[PDB]
Structures are given as C-alpha cells and as structure tokens.
C-alpha cells in the first residue's frame, strides 16, 4: 500500500497552512521550497512530504479541504458572498390560516387577507 | 514565566482581581492553578494517603499510585485533590495542583454567642460520597476538632477551631471519607440562614468591568 | 451437591432415624 503516515500528512498540513503564497502545483519546486522553508533529515522523507503537500495543493484549487485553513479562505467566503434580488411582497396578499388571521386581528392592524380551511 | 491562557487568568496577574472571594462571588470557573497561587500564597500541602492500584493489561500489569492531598491555609480555604500516577512524586505533584483548582470557601461561625471571632460552624452540615456520610456539628469553644486524624487535618487546614463529628459508613476507605468531609464543609456556603436573608444589589462581573484588561489579541 | 439433592439426602436420613427410633418405642 502507499498510505502516507501521519508525519508526512501532518507536515504537509502545517506547510500549506502558512506558505500557500510560495508553493505550487509543481512538486519539483515544492521540493526545493521544503529545503529553505523547513528542516528535514532525509531526502526520502522530504519528497515523500513535498509530493503530498503538492497533492493537497493541487486539489485546494478545486474546493476547500478540511484540516487546512490559511484564513485567506474565510475572507474569500465573504467577498464571494451575495445574492437575492427578488425576496419572499408579490403577489397580492399574504395567505394565512383561519386563526393566523385571528392572530393578526388580535394584536396588530394592516394586513392583506387570504384564508384557507385544512382537512383531516 | 507564567503566560496565562483563559480570560480570568489574565485578569489576575493583571492585578485587576485581588481575592478569590470575588471569584466565588460570581462563581468563576478556575482553570489555571497559578490563579489560586498568586491569590492565596499562605497555602500549605498535606499528603493524606498513598495506596497502590492495579489494572490488568493485554500485555502487562500496570500498578500506578494514587495519592490524596489536602491543601489550605487555616483561615477559610481548603482543597481536596486526588490523582493517580505511575510514580508517587508525580502523583503528589499533580494532586496538589488539582487540589489548588478545587479550592472552596468555608463558612465558619459561633457555637452560640456573638463573641470575638468565629470558632465553630454556622449549621450542622452533611457530606456524602460513596458509602460514607460525614456529619459536622457546631461545638463550643475549646472542644477542638472531634474527628479521626485525617478528617481532623482536612478540617484544621480549612481553619476550623471547634466542631463535633459523626460518621456513617465504611469509613476505613479514606478516599471516600475525606471526599465526604469535603462535601460537608462545601455545604456551609449553601445552607441559607436568617442572617443572609437581606437582599444585595447583585455585583458587576469582573469580566465585564476589566473586559479590556482581559481579552486576547 | 445440588441443593435439592441434599434436601433429598436428609429427607432420607430422617426416615431411617425415624425408623431406628421406632424399634425402641
């Protein structure tokens, strides 16, 4: 099997967490990045890592991934945020119940009227 | 260096709260022992008991060590902490800390005359824990602590000059007995007497006052 | 031994002593 141990997956997380600008979809440079940007004790463990931190990278591009939040998303989430122009005052009148009406008449005032009956 | 976590921890070294009485007033959940350290330094340690326990293991027989510790001044504040560890030192180390966090107030009182400085309790009180019931009775002055050596010490450390005691249960099992004698003294600032019927305006929360001088960044 | 087999054990025992004693009536 080729399941990456935690130490690799843990480390990839930590690096994407705080170096998403820098880092790439390219392993080859992600490799070199790891040298400057982190101490590792063996060439094997580094590529093992950088390969996977590239993987995680390559698919953040296609949507978020649980476990990694470099803040830059939570604000992307708010500026990518808006909708509406229609609401739910058209058309005509609020349709209510017999007693929903009675609720109105027994506290408030102005209301377009529209009743119904319901069955067992 | 300290470095507190928790809002409340920060406020303390911030010198913006002065006594636990405050903390108790608003029932503030303590989480950081140095809070009760810098608040009440006169605290002294008493190791009450160490007894072996044994777990069987799918490859081993862990026998770690359970230590019971009581901390207090002798002026209205006790603690009861219990911890088991692989070493007795470690058990005693951790125990004192938990006993710090646990620290409660005691409501002492007068046997039955208004005279100089409360020496006994406020009411009879009962604490239970497991099978042991410990029952504390207000006693005249110079009666002393009428209780078995352990409970006599837990009481002493909370600063009780004269009480009577009575116990029901398998008292031999120290752990539960002291835990019940603990519950007993905790129950003094629960029991509502006439002298506390008068209404108080209801104080403002330290976390809202020095809100600023708490808070993270 | 099973309780009920012991209950039977001594039921018999009394019958013999019940017997031997009659001998002397």
């Amino acid at each position: 099997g080729r399941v990456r141990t935690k130490t690799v997956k843990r480390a990839s997380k930590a690096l994407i967490e705080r170096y998403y600008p820098k880092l790439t979809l390219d392993f080859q440079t992600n490799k070199r990045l790891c040298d400057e940007i982190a101490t590792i004790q063996s060439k094997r463990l580094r590529n093992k890592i950088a390969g996977y931190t590239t993987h995680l990278m390559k698919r953040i591009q296609k949507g978020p991934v649980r476990g990694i939040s470099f803040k830059l998303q939570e604000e992307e989430r708010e500026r990518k945020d808006q909708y509406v122009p229609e609401v739910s005052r058209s058309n005509g009148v609020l349709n209510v119940d017999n007693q929903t009406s009675d609720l109105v008449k027994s506290l408030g005032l102005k209301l377009p009227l529209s009743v119904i009956n319901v069955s067992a | 260096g300290w470095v507190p976590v928790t809002k409340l921890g920060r406020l303390v070294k911030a010198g913006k709260i002065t006594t636990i009485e405050e903390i108790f007033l608003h029932s503030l959940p303590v989480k950081e022992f140095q809070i009760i350290d810098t608040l009440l330094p006169g605290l002294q340690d008493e190791v009450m008991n160490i007894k072996p326990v044994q777990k069987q293991t799918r490859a081993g027989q862990r026998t770690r060590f359970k230590a019971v510790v009581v901390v207090g001044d002798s002026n209205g504040h006790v603690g009861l902490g219990i911890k088991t560890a692989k070493e007795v030192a470690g058990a005693i180390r951790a125990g004192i800390i938990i006993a710090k966090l646990s620290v409660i107030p005691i409501r002492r009182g007068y046997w039955g005359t208004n005279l100089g400085q409360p020496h006994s309790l406020a009411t009879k009180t009962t604490g239970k824990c497991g099978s042991v019931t410990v029952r504390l009775i207000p006693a005249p002055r110079g009666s002393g602590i009428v209780a078995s050596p352990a409970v006599k010490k837990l009481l002493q450390l909370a600063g009780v000059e004269d009480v009577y005691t009575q116990s029901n249960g398998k008292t031999r099992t120290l752990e539960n007995t002291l835990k019940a004698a603990f519950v007993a003294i905790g129950n003094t600032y629960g029991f509502l007497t006439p002298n506390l019927w008068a209404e108080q305006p209801l104080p403002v929360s330290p976390l809202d006052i020095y809100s600023d001088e708490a808070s993270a960044q | 031994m099973r309780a009920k087999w012991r209950k039977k054990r001594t039921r018999r025992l009394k019958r013999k002593r019940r017997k031997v004693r009659a001998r002397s009536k």
Partner: protein
C-alpha cells in the same frame, strides 16, 4: 387512610420549595395547619396564604419565598416537659441561634421560644428552619 392532616401540608410545602416552586395548594386544612402555617409566617418562612372554602374541609394556597430549607412534623405528638424542650431543639435544629421547634401547649400553638418566655409546655408537633 389519611392519618395526619398536618403531615401532608408540611410535606407538600417542603416538596414545593425543593422543586423551586413559589406556591403550594394544600388539602385539606384545619385549625392546626393554619396555626402552624401562621407560626412559620410570623418568622417569615412563607409569604401569605389563603383559605379557599370548598363546603368541606378546606384547601389552602401558600406562597413561598425561598427562605425555607425544611418544615417537618413530629409524628407522635410526644409530651415535652419544659426541661426536655432543650433536648428537642438540640436534636433537630441546625444551631442555637435560629430555627424554631413549634409545639402545642395548654396556652396555644407556639414556637419553643415563645413557649419559653410564657413558661408553658405540652405536646410537640413539628419544626421550621
């Protein structure tokens, strides 16, 4: 069968308090319940109360403040002997500085302290603190 009409009112009062209520309705009231009810109220362990009148034995609604931990009843109305009133309070009151043992004496239902001042004694029935 209903055996002590005091016992029931008292317990009701206590179960209400315990559960954080402010009012009981007790049934079925009597001269004694009232007098007992009246004695607690005199030292403020309950608010006001009302006798509602079923054309029967009665009902009572009590209003509770929360100042009350316990109101018990002494089931056989033992004789107390003016000397022995001390031994009772000691047995079953939290301290010597408050709480009352209430009892029925030749000259009225009254808490032990009043009983002391008036120099009468009699039978014992209940207590408050």
């Amino acid at each position: 069968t209903r055996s002590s009409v005091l016992a029931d009112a008292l317990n009701a009062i206590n179960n209400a308090e315990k559960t954080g209520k402010r009012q009981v309705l007790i049934r079925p009231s009597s001269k004694v319940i009232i007098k007992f009810l009246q004695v607690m109220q005199k030292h403020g362990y309950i608010g006001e109360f009302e006798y509602i009148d079923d054309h029967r034995s009665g009902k009572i609604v009590v209003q509770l403040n929360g100042r009350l931990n316990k109101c018990g009843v002494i089931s056989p109305r033992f004789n107390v002997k003016i000397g022995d009133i001390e031994k009772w309070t000691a047995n079953l009151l939290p301290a010597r500085q408050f709480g009352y043992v209430i009892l029925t004496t030749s000259a009225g239902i009254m808490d032990h302290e009043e009983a002391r001042r008036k120099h009468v004694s009699g039978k014992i029935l209940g207590f408050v603190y």
